[PDB]
C-alpha cells in the first residue's frame, strides 16, 4: 500500500523497468489519462472537493471533463508524476523538485496533506494496479509532498 | 506592432474587455490552440529551433503535434499568457510572475531573448489578428520576459 510517512526502500533496476513500461502508455496520452484520474479522484472523494476552488459549481463528471480549469490542473499533476518517473535515476533531482512543490501546496494552495496518498492510489490503479514497485514510487512522491508541512 | 523594449501605455477598460472576449474561445481549448501556435512558430522560424532541445529529430508539423513534449511545452506557454490575461487588473501580480519566468528563461533554459516577440506575434494573429489592444498586452509580456536578461 502507498505510504506518506517515514521512508521506503530504494527502487531496484527491475522495478524501474516495469514502472517505465506501465507509464509510457499512460503518459503518451496524459491529457486524457490525467483528466480521468483527477475526475475520478474528485467525484469519489467529496471531503477533498473544497480544496479545488476553481471547480466550484462543477459536479457531474461530464461537466468536469469539459472545464478548462480541470484539464489544466490535471495536466500539471500528471506531468509532475512524469517528472518523478523521469528522475528515478537521480533521486536528488527528484527531491528538490518535489520539496519545492510541497512548499507550494502547504504555503499557497493550503491543501490538507492527507489526500496526497488518496490521489496517488487512483494514479496507481490506472497505471499499474497491483504493482508494488509503482506503489513504492508513489510513496516516495507522497512522503516528499508532505515534507513542507 | 509588438515591442519588447521600453514601456507601453496602460490597458484601457475598453481594451481589457475586447481581450477577455478574444481570449475566452482560444483558452477554452488551449491544448489545441497552444499546440498549433507553437508548431506554427517552430516550423516557420528555423533559427529558434535549436532552443527546443527536447524537439531534436522532430521536423514535420505532424510529428510535432504528436509529441508529448511539444504538447506539454505548448500547454505551459499558453497558460502563462492566460495568467497574464487573468491579471490585467493587478499589473503588480502580473509583473512578479513574469519576471520570475524571465529569470528562468535567461538562467536555465538559456533562450535567445529576441524570439519572445516573434512567438508573441503568432499568438496575436491566432487570438485577435489586428487588435492593437491585444498587441499591447503581448508587449507588456515581452518587455517583462526580457527583464532578467
Ligand atoms: C501525487 C499528488 C499530487 C501531485 C503530484 C500534484 C501536483 C501539483 C502540481 C504540479 C501543481 C501545479 C502547481 C503550480 O501551478 O505551480 C499542483 C497544483 C495544485 N494542487 Fe496539487 N498535486 C497532488 C495532489 C493534490 C491534491 C490531493 C490536492 C487537493 C486535495 C491538490 C490541490 C492542488 C491545488 C489546489 C493546486 C492549485 C491549482 C491552481 O489554483 O491552479 N493537489 N499540484
Ligand atoms: C510569450 C512567450 C513565451 C511564454 C509566455 C513562455 C512561457 C514559458 C513557460 C510558462 C514555460 C514553463 C517553464 C517551467 O516549466 O517552469 C516555458 C518553458 C520554456 N520556454 Fe518559454 N515562453 C515563451 C517564449 C519562448 C521562446 C520564444 C522560446 C524559445 C525560442 C522558449 C523556450 C522555452 C524553453 C526551452 C523552455 C523549457 C522547456 C522544458 O525544458 O521543459 N520560450 N516558457
Curated annotation (Swiss-Prot), chains A, B:
InterPro entries: Globin, Globin-like_sf, Globin/Proto, Globin_lamprey/hagfish. Keywords: Heme, Iron, Metal-binding, Oxygen transport, Transport. It holds the Pfam family Globin. It comes from the Eukaryota. GO terms for molecular function: heme binding; iron ion binding; oxidoreductase activity; oxygen binding; oxygen carrier activity. Transmembrane segments: none annotated. Heme b binds at residues 73, 105. PROSITE patterns: GLOBIN (PS01033). Signal peptide: none annotated. Residues 10-149 form the Globin domain. PANTHER family: CYTOGLOBIN, CYTOGLOBIN-1-RELATED. Globin V is the major component of the 6 globins found in the Sea lamprey. Monomer at high oxygen tension and high pH and dimeric at low oxygen tension and lower pH. Belongs to the globin family. This is Globin-5. It comes from Petromyzon marinus.
Amino acid at each position: 500500500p502507498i505510504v506518506d510517512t517515514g521512508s521506503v526502500a530504494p527502487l531496484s533496476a527491475a522495478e524501474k523497468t516495469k514502472i517505465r513500461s506501465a507509464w509510457a502508455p499512460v503518459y503518451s496520452t496524459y491529457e486524457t489519462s490525467g483528466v480521468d484520474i483527477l475526475v475520478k479522484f474528485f467525484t469519489s472523494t467529496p471531503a477533498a472537493q473544497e480544496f479545488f476552488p476553481k471547480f466550484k459549481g462543477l459536479t457531474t463528471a461530464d461537466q468536469l471533463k469539459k472545464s478548462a480549469d480541470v484539464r489544466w490542473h490535471a495536466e500539471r499533476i500528471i506531468n509532475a508524476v512524469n517528472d518523478a518517473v523521469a528522475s528515478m535515476d537521480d533521486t536528488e533531482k527528484m527531491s528538490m523538485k518535489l520539496r519545492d512543490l510541497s512548499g507550494k501546496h502547504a504555503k499557497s494552495f493550503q491543501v490538507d496533506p492527507q489526500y496526497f496518498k488518496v490521489l496517488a492510489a487512483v494514479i496507481a490503479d490506472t497505471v499499474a494496479a497491483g504493482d508494488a514497485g509503482f506503489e513504492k514510487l508513489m510513496s516516495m512522491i507522497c512522503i516528499l509532498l508532505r515534507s513542507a508541512y
